[PDB]
């Protein structure tokens, strides 16, 4: 969890809204099982992809907020930001692999 950026309602605009670059943003909570398949290739992810990609989590249970703002209907999704604008989402569990291709898809 060392390379996860910990986004909250109050750091959000500037963590990712006012940020350069690709954020991979990451919606879940403790209650969710697959979250916690999603998390442990999400690290491998921001490890292999840094200096390309940030990686993020936002915890919906205790930021609501930005859970509503952004339209989140269940859990896990991901949210791919490109300079502060939502360029792509995936809700649901995915392996490793389709999330590459997933991120790959989404090259200018
Ligand atoms: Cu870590």
């Given at each position: 969890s060392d390379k996860i950026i910990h986004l909250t309602d109050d750091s959000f605009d500037t963590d990712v809204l006012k940020a350069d670059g690709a954020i991979l943003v990451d919606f879940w909570a403790?209650?969710?099982?697959?979250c916690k398949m999603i998390a442990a290739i999400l690290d491998e992810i921001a490890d292999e992809y840094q200096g390309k990609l940030t990686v993020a989590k936002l915890n919906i249970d205790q930021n609501a907020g930005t859970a509503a703002k952004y339209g989140?209907?269940?859990?896990?999704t991901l949210l791919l930001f490109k300079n502060g604008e939502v360029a792509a989402t995936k809700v649901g569990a995915l392996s490793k692999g389709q999330l590459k291709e997933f991120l790959d898809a989404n090259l200018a």
């Open positions: 403790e209650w969710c099982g697959a989140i209907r269940g859990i896990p």
